[PDB]
Structure 1
Amino acid sequence: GSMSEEQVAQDTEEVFRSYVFYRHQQEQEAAPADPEMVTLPLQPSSTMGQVGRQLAIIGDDINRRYDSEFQTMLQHLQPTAENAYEYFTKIATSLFESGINWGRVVALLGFGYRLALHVYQHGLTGFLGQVTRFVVDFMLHHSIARWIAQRGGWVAALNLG
């Protein structure tokens, strides 16, 4: 059968944490990095570490074009540890209201990156571990981990062309 949703949940933690680290580094000559970002669940050369890295690279030009608008919108929302679960949940639910596709799955990683970075840079709170759980649990509970598993896991995102 397919890999389990539990396996995809583990893989998602690895993809997200790698993604966050490599995304911050590619944006650093444009925000302090949360020191927790250098702690990964596994070595970064693992398969899921490579997937996270490649997804960060693929999105670079897209994410740069939307930075100013997202920065303004998050400054207005003022996410903190006290409201981040509510805002993450509502935004993620709306992102997936029409169904699942790989762009939305990868965009959820990007939103998690921006949310964690804002809470740290502006809220002075390290919240990366918590946002990691928000992302993993959201995917588990809204059938996304299952959808991923049934397509062969996260490596599928890099193999659609």
Structure 2
Amino acid sequence: YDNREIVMKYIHYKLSQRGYEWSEVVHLTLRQAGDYFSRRYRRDFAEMSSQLHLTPFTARGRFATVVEELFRDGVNWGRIVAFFEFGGVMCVESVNREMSPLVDNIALWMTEYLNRHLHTWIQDNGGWDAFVELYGP
């Protein structure tokens, strides 16, 4: 599995579901799990998107501080889904705040963090295939 195209296809979906235009069960599983998670934490996500205050030279710091605080006490599948949902929120806010080019950079950050800081736990927990067996259709 290529973590890059997982990020690209998820980000493309999250932006297309908002009106912006930017091997498959994993993408559908991440889609369903992320949509349910964003619905369950709608108030927390509304407060998060309101207090983001995205600027070109603060987006990476806000992204990092939330990601490391999310994975500070370990990794699980739910925190990975929240990681994906958080990236989608940051891409939507980037498009929302006259900063569409930021989407590309965000996609490179997610890919990098997946390839360098989550690939070990994922492989040591059955990989993305185990993610689809547990919470996928």
Which band: TM-score by shorter chain?
A: 0.7 to 0.9
- The corresponding residue for 1:116 is 91
Q: In the aligned structure 2, how far is the partner of 1:83 from the partner of 1:17?
A: 22
State which of 127, 130, 138 in structure 1 corresponds to 2:113: 138
- Residue 160 (str. 1) matches residue 134 (str. 2): yes
Does the 8 Å contact 1:19/1:56 carry over to 2?
Answer: yes
State which of 53, 56, 59 in structure 1 corresponds to 2:31: 56
- Residue 103 (str. 1) matches residue 78 (str. 2): yes
**Count of aligned residue pairs for this structure pair:** 135
- The corresponding residue for 1:79 is 54
What is the DSSP-based 3-state SS (H/G/I as helix, E as strand, rest coil) of the residue aligned with 1:106? helix
RMSD: 2.2
1:129 is aligned with what amino acid?
D
Q: Structure 1 residues 77 and 24, CA, compared in 2 at 3 Å: closer, same or farther?
A: closer
Does the 8 Å contact 2:7/2:107 carry over to 1?
Answer: yes
Structure exhibiting the larger radius of gyration computed from Cα positions:
1
What is the DSSP-based 3-state SS (H/G/I as helix, E as strand, rest coil) of the residue aligned with 2:74? coil
1:98 is aligned with what amino acid?
D
TM-score (structure 2 length as normaliser): 0.82
- Residue 148 (str. 1) matches residue 135 (str. 2): no
What is the DSSP-based 3-state SS (H/G/I as helix, E as strand, rest coil) of the residue aligned with 1:124? coil
- Residue 12 (str. 1) matches residue 3 (str. 2): yes
Does the 8 Å contact 2:33/2:81 carry over to 1?
Answer: no
TM-score (structure 1 length as normaliser): 0.71
| Amino-acid identity (%) | 27
